[PDB]
Structure formats: C-alpha cells, structure tokens
Amino acid sequence: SLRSVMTLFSNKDDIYCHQVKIVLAEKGVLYENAEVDLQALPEDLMELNPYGTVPTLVDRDLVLFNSRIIMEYLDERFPHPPLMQVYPVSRAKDRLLMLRIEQDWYPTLAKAENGTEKEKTSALKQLKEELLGIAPIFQQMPYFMNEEFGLVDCYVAPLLWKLKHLGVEFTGTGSKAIKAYMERVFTRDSFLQSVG
Amino acid sequence: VMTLFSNKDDIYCHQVKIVLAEKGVLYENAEVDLQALPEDLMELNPYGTVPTLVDRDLVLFNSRIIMEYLDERFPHPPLMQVYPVSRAKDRLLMLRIEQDWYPTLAKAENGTEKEKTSALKQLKEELLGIAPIFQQMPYFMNEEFGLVDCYVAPLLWKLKHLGVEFTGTGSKAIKAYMERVFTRDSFLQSVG
C-alpha cells in the first residue's frame, strides 16, 4: 500500500463517502478515517471545510470535498489501476453516465431510505423496475457499460449495496445479469475494504 | 457535424461557447427557445436541457462535462493545469463559483424588482470583497487563462449588462481583469 498522510472525513452510511472509500482502496492508498455524525460535525472539519459536508479529503494543506472531484483527483494522482479510460470520447460517456446515475437514481434511493412508508415501497419498486430494465447492458460487457471496472461502477455498486440491505431481491427477467454484476463488484478487494 | 443547442442568454451556454472559441473549433449554433423546445433536441437529449453538444455520434449535456470533453478532445491551448493538485483546486473553485454565485445572479435576472436590486448589491459586495484575489494573478487564481475564467467571465459579463459598475477600493483589479478577458478573441467570438 501507499503510505499517504491523508484524512477522510466521512460518514459510514453516506453513499458519497462509500464511493470515495472504494477509490481509495482500489488505489491502495493508506489514510485515516475520521467518522462524523451529520448532526454533530467536528470543529476541525468546520475549520478545514466551511460548508461542513462529507466526504472531505485532507492531504497536508490540500482540502477537497465533493466526491466526484475527490475521485478524479485520486485517479489522476494515482494512475494504477486506471479507473477511467484514456480517450476523450469514452471519458465523456462515463462522466455523462455518472451524472445520470446520480441525478436519476440517487434521489429515489434517498426517498427509499427516508420517506414515508408508501414512498419507500414506491421508491423501491421504481428502482427495482429500472435496474431490471437495464439488464440487457450486461449481455455485452461485464462492468457497467465498460469492459473493465471503473468510476461508473463506483457509482453503481454503492447503490446496489444499499438496495440489497433494504430488502430488494432481484427475480424475473434481467435478474441473472444483475446478480452476476453484484458478485463481480461486491467481492472485489476494494469493495471488501470499503464496507469493512 | 458539430452542433451546439444553446440559448443566447444562458450563462452555461456562454461557458461552452468560450471554450469552443478557444479551441478554434467550428460548430453550428442551434438556437433554442426555452419555453418551446424543438423535437430534434428532445430526441438527442431526453432531459431537454441546454447546452447540449453533438459531436459526430456523441451527445453531451451539462456544461462542466462538455468543457472537460472539449479540453481533452482538443488539447491546445490547454485550459487546465497539468498537476493533479492544481486541477483539483480549480475544479473546486469552479464548483464553489457555480454553487455560491450563480444563484444570486439568476435572482438578479429572474426576480421581482426588489429581489433584483438586492441580489445585485450582494454580488457586487462579494466581488469587491475578493478584490485581492483578482490582485494576485492576471487570470483568476491562475497565471494563464483557463476553465476557471470560463466560470468567472460570463458572470461579470452578465453583471456589466445589468448596470453594475465597479468603483471604490479593489475595483481596479476587477476592471483590469474584465478588460483582460473581455477583449480576448475567444471571448468576443463567444458573445458575437
């Protein structure tokens, strides 16, 4: 592993913190985890990041927040293994895919965790239908619209992980490809470290 | 073929047009009325937002993604630094500009007459507050013109056209910055 002197301020149930921990583990970067309670933020986080958000990555004098900015920083600073492709069109398609995952699926997931009972049930059914709907994606490629594991999977895997633990179970048409993808990502060394 | 679906008054369209002009790339501007979106935009981009860029087979939206794509596809002149640390700092600047300054700018164009005059005073206040930043380097927190200036310049341009004038302390660094970015060939093309 790499002996960095980084501190990650994070919360263990936050999906954005989860994305960043997977990238840190992929890159083999050692860092200190500083757990934070969202209602009771530590003053040292406030000192470094006045917006008081997590994840916040601190490396010596550098302070970063926003998980997309953090992840691209780590991929650029620590090239191996590559979590984005090399060529500009692939990079743009992956970026657009990420934005859409975040925009379209993440709020439904949040509703599924934090809504009223009919909202939850309604959010879960909606996410379930949508994920089943994109099943054909895998008949071509083992990672999400990619041949190799990358940042897009760092958006999809935390979401599937949360759905699994909310009781979602995939059956019917498209469920074989989704279960296969889950095994492929959940069993990776980095994912194992991220939920450790 | 290269097409930008764009609205002429939209700040995010303006960002992308500056980057297109810097890279010297030819494109067709498809003007869109926000209240009546054309069908050919809807079929390429189900979300119906602008700017939307179409490059041969690739469809892109969201101005940040378009700009990064252009900077990577058309490498010179480079609009981002080379070091991962500097690139991250600039990304974070841009995020903060867009999150903290842009809503106040929208309010200054879209509000009631009370809302508008209030927003204009706030923005003018915060910009004069950071006068010593404009003082530091010729471009915004950078020695060379880059993507960060593509966030700052369109905002100052809108303000100029909303009647804002800078006088008093630090207004000198801000005016000198405006003169310097507004008179670049790429910027003059982007407003043409």
mmCIF file of C-alpha atoms in Angstrom:
data_model
loop_
_atom_site.group_PDB
_atom_site.id
_atom_site.type_symbol
_atom_site.label_atom_id
_atom_site.label_comp_id
_atom_site.label_asym_id
_atom_site.label_seq_id
_atom_site.Cartn_x
_atom_site.Cartn_y
_atom_site.Cartn_z
ATOM 1 C CA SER A 1 0.000 0.000 0.000
ATOM 2 C CA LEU A 2 0.920 3.670 -0.277
ATOM 3 C CA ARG A 3 1.831 5.496 2.901
ATOM 4 C CA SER A 4 -0.057 8.720 2.388
ATOM 5 C CA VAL A 5 -0.858 11.083 5.232
ATOM 6 C CA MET A 6 -4.461 11.656 4.259
ATOM 7 C CA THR A 7 -7.551 12.032 6.418
ATOM 8 C CA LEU A 8 -11.001 11.279 5.103
ATOM 9 C CA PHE A 9 -13.914 12.849 6.993
ATOM 10 C CA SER A 10 -16.824 10.627 6.276
ATOM 11 C CA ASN A 11 -19.996 9.034 7.459
ATOM 12 C CA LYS A 12 -20.386 5.248 7.242
ATOM 13 C CA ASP A 13 -23.932 5.338 5.848
ATOM 14 C CA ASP A 14 -23.352 8.080 3.250
ATOM 15 C CA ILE A 15 -23.280 6.824 -0.377
ATOM 16 C CA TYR A 16 -20.799 9.545 -1.482
ATOM 17 C CA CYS A 17 -18.389 8.541 1.302
ATOM 18 C CA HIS A 18 -18.759 4.962 0.128
ATOM 19 C CA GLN A 19 -17.814 5.901 -3.491
ATOM 20 C CA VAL A 20 -14.633 7.599 -2.270
ATOM 21 C CA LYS A 21 -13.590 4.666 0.015
ATOM 22 C CA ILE A 22 -13.833 2.266 -2.889
ATOM 23 C CA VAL A 23 -11.499 4.506 -4.940
ATOM 24 C CA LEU A 24 -9.033 4.895 -2.052
ATOM 25 C CA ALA A 25 -8.895 1.082 -1.696
ATOM 26 C CA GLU A 26 -8.554 0.474 -5.444
ATOM 27 C CA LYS A 27 -5.528 2.772 -5.456
ATOM 28 C CA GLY A 28 -4.063 1.119 -2.290
ATOM 29 C CA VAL A 29 -3.776 4.449 -0.522
ATOM 30 C CA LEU A 30 -3.469 4.415 3.296
ATOM 31 C CA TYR A 31 -5.451 7.065 5.042
ATOM 32 C CA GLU A 32 -7.065 7.860 8.384
ATOM 33 C CA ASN A 33 -10.898 7.527 8.561
ATOM 34 C CA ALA A 34 -12.481 10.239 10.759
ATOM 35 C CA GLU A 35 -16.063 9.219 11.322
ATOM 36 C CA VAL A 36 -18.528 12.087 11.546
ATOM 37 C CA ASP A 37 -22.069 12.334 12.819
ATOM 38 C CA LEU A 38 -24.115 14.534 10.474
ATOM 39 C CA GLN A 39 -25.975 16.319 13.334
ATOM 40 C CA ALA A 40 -22.790 16.914 15.359
ATOM 41 C CA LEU A 41 -19.963 17.867 12.983
ATOM 42 C CA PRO A 42 -16.488 18.118 14.438
ATOM 43 C CA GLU A 43 -14.986 21.643 14.736
ATOM 44 C CA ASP A 44 -11.829 20.536 12.923
ATOM 45 C CA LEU A 45 -13.936 19.639 9.812
ATOM 46 C CA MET A 46 -15.609 23.107 10.050
ATOM 47 C CA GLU A 47 -12.136 24.746 10.222
ATOM 48 C CA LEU A 48 -10.991 22.932 7.036
ATOM 49 C CA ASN A 49 -14.292 22.858 5.090
ATOM 50 C CA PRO A 50 -16.703 25.677 5.985
ATOM 51 C CA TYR A 51 -19.569 24.066 4.032
ATOM 52 C CA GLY A 52 -19.331 21.238 6.593
ATOM 53 C CA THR A 53 -20.002 18.426 4.088
ATOM 54 C CA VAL A 54 -18.614 14.919 3.763
ATOM 55 C CA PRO A 55 -16.685 13.303 2.199
ATOM 56 C CA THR A 56 -13.863 15.786 2.778
ATOM 57 C CA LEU A 57 -10.327 14.544 1.949
ATOM 58 C CA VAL A 58 -7.442 16.376 3.583
ATOM 59 C CA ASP A 59 -3.880 15.900 2.465
ATOM 60 C CA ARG A 60 -1.441 18.084 4.339
ATOM 61 C CA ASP A 61 -2.523 21.524 3.188
ATOM 62 C CA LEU A 62 -4.944 20.400 0.429
ATOM 63 C CA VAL A 63 -8.642 20.248 1.343
ATOM 64 C CA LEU A 64 -11.100 18.612 -1.084
ATOM 65 C CA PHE A 65 -14.851 17.962 -0.871
ATOM 66 C CA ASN A 66 -17.359 16.704 -3.408
ATOM 67 C CA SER A 67 -16.880 13.042 -4.161
ATOM 68 C CA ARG A 68 -16.603 13.464 -7.975
ATOM 69 C CA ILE A 69 -13.760 15.964 -7.547
ATOM 70 C CA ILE A 70 -12.095 13.709 -4.977
ATOM 71 C CA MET A 71 -12.343 10.611 -7.163
ATOM 72 C CA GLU A 72 -10.943 12.289 -10.228
ATOM 73 C CA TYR A 73 -8.149 13.741 -8.121
ATOM 74 C CA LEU A 74 -7.248 10.236 -6.864
ATOM 75 C CA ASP A 75 -7.435 8.707 -10.350
ATOM 76 C CA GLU A 76 -5.139 11.491 -11.722
ATOM 77 C CA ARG A 77 -2.670 11.445 -8.838
ATOM 78 C CA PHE A 78 -2.555 7.598 -8.545
ATOM 79 C CA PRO A 79 -2.733 6.202 -12.078
ATOM 80 C CA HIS A 80 -2.671 2.464 -11.211
ATOM 81 C CA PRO A 81 -5.024 0.762 -11.692
ATOM 82 C CA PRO A 82 -6.854 3.140 -14.113
ATOM 83 C CA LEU A 83 -10.489 3.809 -13.159
ATOM 84 C CA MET A 84 -11.183 5.879 -16.343
ATOM 85 C CA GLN A 85 -10.224 5.261 -19.902
ATOM 86 C CA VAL A 86 -7.579 7.115 -21.745
ATOM 87 C CA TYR A 87 -9.521 8.529 -24.697
ATOM 88 C CA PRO A 88 -11.700 11.647 -24.564
ATOM 89 C CA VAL A 89 -14.957 10.236 -26.018
ATOM 90 C CA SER A 90 -15.021 7.244 -23.540
ATOM 91 C CA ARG A 91 -14.194 9.598 -20.697
ATOM 92 C CA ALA A 92 -17.094 11.891 -21.636
ATOM 93 C CA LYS A 93 -19.572 8.995 -21.936
ATOM 94 C CA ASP A 94 -18.528 7.710 -18.479
ATOM 95 C CA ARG A 95 -18.892 11.169 -16.991
ATOM 96 C CA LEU A 96 -22.356 11.563 -18.500
ATOM 97 C CA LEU A 97 -23.362 8.094 -17.229
ATOM 98 C CA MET A 98 -22.241 9.072 -13.739
ATOM 99 C CA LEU A 99 -24.147 12.313 -13.782
ATOM 100 C CA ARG A 100 -27.288 10.476 -14.878
ATOM 101 C CA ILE A 101 -26.935 7.751 -12.225
ATOM 102 C CA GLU A 102 -26.563 10.419 -9.595
ATOM 103 C CA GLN A 103 -29.390 12.590 -10.971
ATOM 104 C CA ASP A 104 -31.970 9.924 -11.803
ATOM 105 C CA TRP A 105 -31.321 7.021 -9.327
ATOM 106 C CA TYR A 106 -29.753 8.555 -6.215
ATOM 107 C CA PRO A 107 -32.784 10.711 -5.204
ATOM 108 C CA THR A 108 -35.086 7.688 -5.491
ATOM 109 C CA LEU A 109 -32.672 5.745 -3.251
ATOM 110 C CA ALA A 110 -32.753 8.591 -0.725
ATOM 111 C CA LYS A 111 -36.611 8.539 -0.818
ATOM 112 C CA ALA A 112 -36.404 4.752 -0.225
ATOM 113 C CA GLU A 113 -34.407 5.293 2.945
ATOM 114 C CA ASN A 114 -36.026 8.445 4.295
ATOM 115 C CA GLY A 115 -39.620 8.712 3.039
ATOM 116 C CA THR A 116 -42.999 7.692 4.438
ATOM 117 C CA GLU A 117 -43.954 4.023 4.134
ATOM 118 C CA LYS A 118 -45.795 4.358 0.800
ATOM 119 C CA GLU A 119 -42.903 6.498 -0.564
ATOM 120 C CA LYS A 120 -40.348 3.828 0.461
ATOM 121 C CA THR A 121 -42.345 0.984 -1.118
ATOM 122 C CA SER A 122 -42.926 3.149 -4.143
ATOM 123 C CA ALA A 123 -39.214 4.153 -4.411
ATOM 124 C CA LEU A 124 -38.073 0.517 -4.038
ATOM 125 C CA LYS A 125 -40.422 -0.740 -6.753
ATOM 126 C CA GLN A 126 -39.349 2.053 -9.080
ATOM 127 C CA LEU A 127 -35.583 1.370 -8.576
ATOM 128 C CA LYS A 128 -36.204 -2.346 -8.945
ATOM 129 C CA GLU A 129 -38.080 -1.910 -12.257
ATOM 130 C CA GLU A 130 -35.430 0.485 -13.633
ATOM 131 C CA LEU A 131 -32.475 -1.726 -12.753
ATOM 132 C CA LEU A 132 -34.220 -4.773 -14.255
ATOM 133 C CA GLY A 133 -34.902 -2.608 -17.347
ATOM 134 C CA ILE A 134 -31.167 -2.041 -17.954
ATOM 135 C CA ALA A 135 -30.275 -5.730 -17.579
ATOM 136 C CA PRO A 136 -29.532 -6.096 -21.343
ATOM 137 C CA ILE A 137 -26.463 -3.898 -20.689
ATOM 138 C CA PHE A 138 -24.524 -6.912 -19.325
ATOM 139 C CA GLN A 139 -25.080 -9.324 -22.245
ATOM 140 C CA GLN A 140 -22.307 -7.223 -23.836
ATOM 141 C CA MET A 141 -19.948 -6.155 -21.027
ATOM 142 C CA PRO A 142 -19.113 -7.391 -17.510
ATOM 143 C CA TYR A 143 -18.860 -3.925 -15.842
ATOM 144 C CA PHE A 144 -21.366 -1.146 -16.143
ATOM 145 C CA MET A 145 -21.138 -0.127 -19.855
ATOM 146 C CA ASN A 146 -17.434 -0.966 -19.651
ATOM 147 C CA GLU A 147 -15.041 -3.858 -20.176
ATOM 148 C CA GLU A 148 -13.048 -3.019 -17.010
ATOM 149 C CA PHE A 149 -14.014 -1.891 -13.516
ATOM 150 C CA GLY A 150 -14.030 1.913 -13.187
ATOM 151 C CA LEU A 151 -15.542 5.045 -11.657
ATOM 152 C CA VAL A 152 -19.022 4.307 -13.109
ATOM 153 C CA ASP A 153 -19.033 1.051 -11.054
ATOM 154 C CA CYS A 154 -18.066 3.185 -8.039
ATOM 155 C CA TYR A 155 -21.436 4.892 -8.581
ATOM 156 C CA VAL A 156 -23.497 1.753 -9.293
ATOM 157 C CA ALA A 157 -22.063 -0.665 -6.628
ATOM 158 C CA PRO A 158 -22.787 1.531 -3.559
ATOM 159 C CA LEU A 159 -26.359 1.873 -4.822
ATOM 160 C CA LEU A 160 -26.883 -1.892 -5.293
ATOM 161 C CA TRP A 161 -25.279 -2.466 -1.898
ATOM 162 C CA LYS A 162 -27.841 -0.173 -0.273
ATOM 163 C CA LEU A 163 -30.733 -1.743 -2.171
ATOM 164 C CA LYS A 164 -29.635 -5.262 -1.119
ATOM 165 C CA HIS A 165 -29.711 -4.104 2.553
ATOM 166 C CA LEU A 166 -33.116 -2.546 2.155
ATOM 167 C CA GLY A 167 -34.512 -5.965 1.222
ATOM 168 C CA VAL A 168 -34.553 -5.752 -2.587
ATOM 169 C CA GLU A 169 -34.149 -9.221 -4.170
ATOM 170 C CA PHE A 170 -33.923 -9.497 -7.964
ATOM 171 C CA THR A 171 -36.125 -12.128 -9.653
ATOM 172 C CA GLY A 172 -37.555 -12.482 -13.175
ATOM 173 C CA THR A 173 -36.275 -11.063 -16.472
ATOM 174 C CA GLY A 174 -32.882 -9.423 -16.235
ATOM 175 C CA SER A 175 -32.171 -10.738 -12.737
ATOM 176 C CA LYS A 176 -29.381 -13.152 -13.759
ATOM 177 C CA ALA A 177 -27.198 -10.366 -15.220
ATOM 178 C CA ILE A 178 -27.788 -8.086 -12.156
ATOM 179 C CA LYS A 179 -26.841 -10.861 -9.657
ATOM 180 C CA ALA A 180 -23.781 -11.680 -11.722
ATOM 181 C CA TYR A 181 -22.707 -7.964 -11.681
ATOM 182 C CA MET A 182 -23.235 -7.779 -7.925
ATOM 183 C CA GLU A 183 -20.930 -10.702 -7.288
ATOM 184 C CA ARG A 184 -18.345 -9.194 -9.660
ATOM 185 C CA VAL A 185 -18.231 -5.872 -7.781
ATOM 186 C CA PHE A 186 -19.021 -6.834 -4.120
ATOM 187 C CA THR A 187 -16.262 -9.463 -3.986
ATOM 188 C CA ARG A 188 -13.501 -7.160 -5.291
ATOM 189 C CA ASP A 189 -10.705 -6.435 -2.769
ATOM 190 C CA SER A 190 -11.520 -2.706 -2.827
ATOM 191 C CA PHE A 191 -15.209 -3.143 -2.210
ATOM 192 C CA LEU A 192 -14.432 -5.563 0.667
ATOM 193 C CA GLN A 193 -12.190 -2.930 2.261
ATOM 194 C CA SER A 194 -14.781 -0.202 1.722
ATOM 195 C CA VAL A 195 -17.503 -1.979 3.757
ATOM 196 C CA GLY A 196 -15.024 -3.379 6.306
ATOM 197 C CA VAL B 1 -21.014 17.624 -37.984
ATOM 198 C CA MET B 2 -20.805 19.606 -34.705
ATOM 199 C CA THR B 3 -23.856 21.308 -33.250
ATOM 200 C CA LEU B 4 -24.438 23.262 -30.091
ATOM 201 C CA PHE B 5 -28.021 23.587 -28.856
ATOM 202 C CA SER B 6 -27.880 26.758 -26.986
ATOM 203 C CA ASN B 7 -29.780 29.685 -25.619
ATOM 204 C CA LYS B 8 -28.355 33.137 -26.250
ATOM 205 C CA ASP B 9 -28.979 34.472 -22.706
ATOM 206 C CA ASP B 10 -27.955 31.295 -20.813
ATOM 207 C CA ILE B 11 -24.756 31.520 -18.750
ATOM 208 C CA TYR B 12 -23.943 27.781 -19.157
ATOM 209 C CA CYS B 13 -24.188 28.100 -22.950
ATOM 210 C CA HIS B 14 -21.914 31.048 -22.742
ATOM 211 C CA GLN B 15 -19.230 28.987 -20.828
ATOM 212 C CA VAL B 16 -19.192 26.333 -23.520
ATOM 213 C CA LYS B 17 -19.044 28.880 -26.401
ATOM 214 C CA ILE B 18 -15.909 30.442 -24.889
ATOM 215 C CA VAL B 19 -14.243 27.005 -24.739
ATOM 216 C CA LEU B 20 -15.327 26.231 -28.346
ATOM 217 C CA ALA B 21 -13.793 29.546 -29.469
ATOM 218 C CA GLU B 22 -10.533 28.973 -27.511
ATOM 219 C CA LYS B 23 -10.059 25.598 -29.192
ATOM 220 C CA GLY B 24 -10.931 27.182 -32.592
ATOM 221 C CA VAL B 25 -13.466 24.502 -33.434
ATOM 222 C CA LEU B 26 -16.252 25.061 -35.974
ATOM 223 C CA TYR B 27 -19.798 24.368 -34.909
ATOM 224 C CA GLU B 28 -23.373 25.109 -35.849
ATOM 225 C CA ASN B 29 -25.265 27.097 -33.197
ATOM 226 C CA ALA B 30 -28.857 25.753 -32.907
ATOM 227 C CA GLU B 31 -30.735 28.484 -31.065
ATOM 228 C CA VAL B 32 -33.380 27.228 -28.687
ATOM 229 C CA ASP B 33 -36.306 28.956 -27.047
ATOM 230 C CA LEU B 34 -36.538 27.519 -23.515
ATOM 231 C CA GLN B 35 -40.347 27.757 -23.427
ATOM 232 C CA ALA B 36 -40.774 25.769 -26.674
ATOM 233 C CA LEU B 37 -38.127 23.076 -27.015
ATOM 234 C CA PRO B 38 -37.562 21.644 -30.530
ATOM 235 C CA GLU B 39 -38.189 17.925 -31.180
ATOM 236 C CA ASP B 40 -34.686 17.260 -32.590
ATOM 237 C CA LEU B 41 -33.207 18.329 -29.204
ATOM 238 C CA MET B 42 -35.653 16.108 -27.253
ATOM 239 C CA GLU B 43 -34.709 13.015 -29.321
ATOM 240 C CA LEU B 44 -30.959 13.533 -28.663
ATOM 241 C CA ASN B 45 -31.319 14.648 -25.056
ATOM 242 C CA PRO B 46 -34.476 13.333 -23.268
ATOM 243 C CA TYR B 47 -33.800 15.793 -20.402
ATOM 244 C CA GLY B 48 -34.258 18.747 -22.813
ATOM 245 C CA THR B 49 -31.547 20.971 -21.278
ATOM 246 C CA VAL B 50 -29.072 23.396 -22.863
ATOM 247 C CA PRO B 51 -26.201 23.490 -23.608
ATOM 248 C CA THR B 52 -26.288 20.223 -25.484
ATOM 249 C CA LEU B 53 -23.404 19.448 -27.771
ATOM 250 C CA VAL B 54 -23.432 16.924 -30.602
ATOM 251 C CA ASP B 55 -20.076 15.750 -31.942
ATOM 252 C CA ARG B 56 -20.334 13.240 -34.819
ATOM 253 C CA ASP B 57 -22.128 10.442 -32.863
ATOM 254 C CA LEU B 58 -21.594 11.742 -29.275
ATOM 255 C CA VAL B 59 -24.316 13.663 -27.464
ATOM 256 C CA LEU B 60 -23.343 15.637 -24.317
ATOM 257 C CA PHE B 61 -25.076 17.861 -21.862
ATOM 258 C CA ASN B 62 -24.185 19.674 -18.683
ATOM 259 C CA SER B 63 -21.689 22.432 -19.323
ATOM 260 C CA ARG B 64 -18.979 21.011 -16.986
ATOM 261 C CA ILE B 65 -18.915 17.681 -18.862
ATOM 262 C CA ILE B 66 -18.875 19.443 -22.267
ATOM 263 C CA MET B 67 -15.989 21.690 -21.252
ATOM 264 C CA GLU B 68 -13.912 18.826 -19.916
ATOM 265 C CA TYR B 69 -14.639 16.830 -23.051
ATOM 266 C CA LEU B 70 -13.524 19.804 -25.255
ATOM 267 C CA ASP B 71 -10.369 20.355 -23.186
ATOM 268 C CA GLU B 72 -9.496 16.669 -23.568
ATOM 269 C CA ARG B 73 -10.559 16.182 -27.177
ATOM 270 C CA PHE B 74 -8.869 19.414 -28.378
ATOM 271 C CA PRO B 75 -5.763 19.565 -26.251
ATOM 272 C CA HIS B 76 -4.306 23.017 -27.263
ATOM 273 C CA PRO B 77 -4.452 25.623 -25.876
ATOM 274 C CA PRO B 78 -4.673 23.794 -22.535
ATOM 275 C CA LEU B 79 -7.386 25.261 -20.286
ATOM 276 C CA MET B 80 -6.485 23.192 -17.150
ATOM 277 C CA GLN B 81 -3.167 22.841 -15.408
ATOM 278 C CA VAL B 82 -1.173 19.619 -15.523
ATOM 279 C CA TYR B 83 -0.654 18.684 -11.825
ATOM 280 C CA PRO B 84 -3.487 16.657 -10.144
ATOM 281 C CA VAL B 85 -3.389 19.013 -7.114
ATOM 282 C CA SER B 86 -3.856 22.211 -9.225
ATOM 283 C CA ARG B 87 -6.577 20.580 -11.348
ATOM 284 C CA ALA B 88 -8.489 19.587 -8.217
ATOM 285 C CA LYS B 89 -8.161 23.069 -6.706
ATOM 286 C CA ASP B 90 -9.509 24.595 -9.951
ATOM 287 C CA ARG B 91 -12.380 22.120 -10.074
ATOM 288 C CA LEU B 92 -13.252 23.065 -6.532
ATOM 289 C CA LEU B 93 -13.115 26.830 -7.348
ATOM 290 C CA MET B 94 -15.486 26.266 -10.238
ATOM 291 C CA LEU B 95 -17.867 24.188 -8.105
ATOM 292 C CA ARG B 96 -17.909 26.988 -5.500
ATOM 293 C CA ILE B 97 -18.419 29.787 -8.059
ATOM 294 C CA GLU B 98 -21.357 27.952 -9.594
ATOM 295 C CA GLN B 99 -22.908 26.971 -6.239
ATOM 296 C CA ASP B 100 -22.424 30.200 -4.339
ATOM 297 C CA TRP B 101 -22.502 32.991 -7.025
ATOM 298 C CA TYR B 102 -24.667 31.721 -9.834
ATOM 299 C CA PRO B 103 -27.998 31.521 -7.862
ATOM 300 C CA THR B 104 -27.637 35.137 -6.770
ATOM 301 C CA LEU B 105 -27.034 36.016 -10.457
ATOM 302 C CA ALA B 106 -30.205 34.163 -11.512
ATOM 303 C CA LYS B 107 -32.139 36.026 -8.816
ATOM 304 C CA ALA B 108 -30.804 39.314 -10.192
ATOM 305 C CA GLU B 109 -32.330 38.435 -13.599
ATOM 306 C CA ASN B 110 -35.463 36.476 -12.671
ATOM 307 C CA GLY B 111 -36.819 38.054 -9.504
ATOM 308 C CA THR B 112 -39.189 40.898 -8.703
ATOM 309 C CA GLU B 113 -37.694 44.401 -8.804
ATOM 310 C CA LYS B 114 -36.968 44.171 -5.068
ATOM 311 C CA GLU B 115 -35.262 40.785 -5.395
ATOM 312 C CA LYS B 116 -33.194 42.078 -8.383
ATOM 313 C CA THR B 117 -31.739 45.171 -6.680
ATOM 314 C CA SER B 118 -30.901 43.210 -3.581
ATOM 315 C CA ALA B 119 -29.072 40.390 -5.477
ATOM 316 C CA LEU B 120 -27.081 42.973 -7.463
ATOM 317 C CA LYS B 121 -25.855 44.586 -4.214
ATOM 318 C CA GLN B 122 -24.882 41.216 -2.677
ATOM 319 C CA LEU B 123 -22.867 40.053 -5.774
ATOM 320 C CA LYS B 124 -21.185 43.418 -6.144
ATOM 321 C CA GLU B 125 -20.302 43.211 -2.392
ATOM 322 C CA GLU B 126 -18.767 39.739 -2.519
ATOM 323 C CA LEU B 127 -16.788 40.529 -5.688
ATOM 324 C CA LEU B 128 -15.341 43.671 -4.132
ATOM 325 C CA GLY B 129 -14.564 41.517 -1.040
ATOM 326 C CA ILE B 130 -12.222 39.259 -3.019
ATOM 327 C CA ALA B 131 -10.525 42.120 -4.864
ATOM 328 C CA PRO B 132 -7.103 40.978 -3.588
ATOM 329 C CA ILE B 133 -7.643 37.596 -5.337
ATOM 330 C CA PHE B 134 -8.001 39.419 -8.716
ATOM 331 C CA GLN B 135 -4.950 41.298 -7.497
ATOM 332 C CA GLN B 136 -2.824 38.118 -7.098
ATOM 333 C CA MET B 137 -2.525 36.916 -10.717
ATOM 334 C CA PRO B 138 -3.559 38.062 -14.182
ATOM 335 C CA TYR B 139 -6.212 35.375 -14.608
ATOM 336 C CA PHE B 140 -8.454 34.128 -11.811
ATOM 337 C CA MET B 141 -6.144 32.322 -9.311
ATOM 338 C CA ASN B 142 -4.015 31.354 -12.283
ATOM 339 C CA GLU B 143 -1.308 32.777 -14.413
ATOM 340 C CA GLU B 144 -2.899 31.556 -17.652
ATOM 341 C CA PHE B 145 -6.444 31.830 -18.935
ATOM 342 C CA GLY B 146 -8.361 28.591 -18.249
ATOM 343 C CA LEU B 147 -11.629 26.929 -17.349
ATOM 344 C CA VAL B 148 -11.945 28.826 -14.117
ATOM 345 C CA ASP B 149 -12.111 32.083 -16.183
ATOM 346 C CA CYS B 150 -14.908 30.451 -18.180
ATOM 347 C CA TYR B 151 -16.944 30.470 -14.925
ATOM 348 C CA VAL B 152 -15.954 33.914 -13.725
ATOM 349 C CA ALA B 153 -16.034 35.860 -17.086
ATOM 350 C CA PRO B 154 -19.646 35.073 -18.130
ATOM 351 C CA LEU B 155 -20.809 36.176 -14.659
ATOM 352 C CA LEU B 156 -19.004 39.518 -14.850
ATOM 353 C CA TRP B 157 -20.318 39.937 -18.427
ATOM 354 C CA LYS B 158 -23.909 39.486 -17.219
ATOM 355 C CA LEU B 159 -23.312 41.944 -14.410
ATOM 356 C CA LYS B 160 -21.866 44.553 -16.767
ATOM 357 C CA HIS B 161 -25.020 44.311 -18.877
ATOM 358 C CA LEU B 162 -27.174 44.632 -15.738
ATOM 359 C CA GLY B 163 -25.799 48.042 -14.991
ATOM 360 C CA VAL B 164 -23.206 47.163 -12.361
ATOM 361 C CA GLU B 165 -20.173 49.448 -12.280
ATOM 362 C CA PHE B 166 -17.161 48.929 -10.049
ATOM 363 C CA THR B 167 -15.730 51.929 -8.164
ATOM 364 C CA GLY B 168 -14.100 52.284 -4.744
ATOM 365 C CA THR B 169 -11.303 50.079 -3.340
ATOM 366 C CA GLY B 170 -10.222 46.961 -5.281
ATOM 367 C CA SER B 171 -12.500 47.911 -8.168
ATOM 368 C CA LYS B 172 -9.262 48.480 -10.068
ATOM 369 C CA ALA B 173 -8.097 44.846 -10.019
ATOM 370 C CA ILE B 174 -11.600 43.676 -11.065
ATOM 371 C CA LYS B 175 -11.848 46.156 -14.015
ATOM 372 C CA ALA B 176 -8.346 45.217 -15.181
ATOM 373 C CA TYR B 177 -9.407 41.544 -15.103
ATOM 374 C CA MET B 178 -12.570 42.351 -17.089
ATOM 375 C CA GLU B 179 -10.631 44.297 -19.693
ATOM 376 C CA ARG B 180 -8.173 41.408 -19.996
ATOM 377 C CA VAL B 181 -10.743 38.577 -20.500
ATOM 378 C CA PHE B 182 -13.465 40.514 -22.388
ATOM 379 C CA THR B 183 -11.004 41.592 -25.090
ATOM 380 C CA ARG B 184 -9.648 38.084 -25.850
ATOM 381 C CA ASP B 185 -10.628 36.868 -29.369
ATOM 382 C CA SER B 186 -12.373 33.810 -27.914
ATOM 383 C CA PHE B 187 -14.461 35.803 -25.518
ATOM 384 C CA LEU B 188 -15.521 38.313 -28.269
ATOM 385 C CA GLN B 189 -16.462 35.404 -30.525
ATOM 386 C CA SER B 190 -18.489 33.776 -27.696
ATOM 387 C CA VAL B 191 -20.761 36.820 -27.336
ATOM 388 C CA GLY B 192 -20.966 37.506 -31.130
#
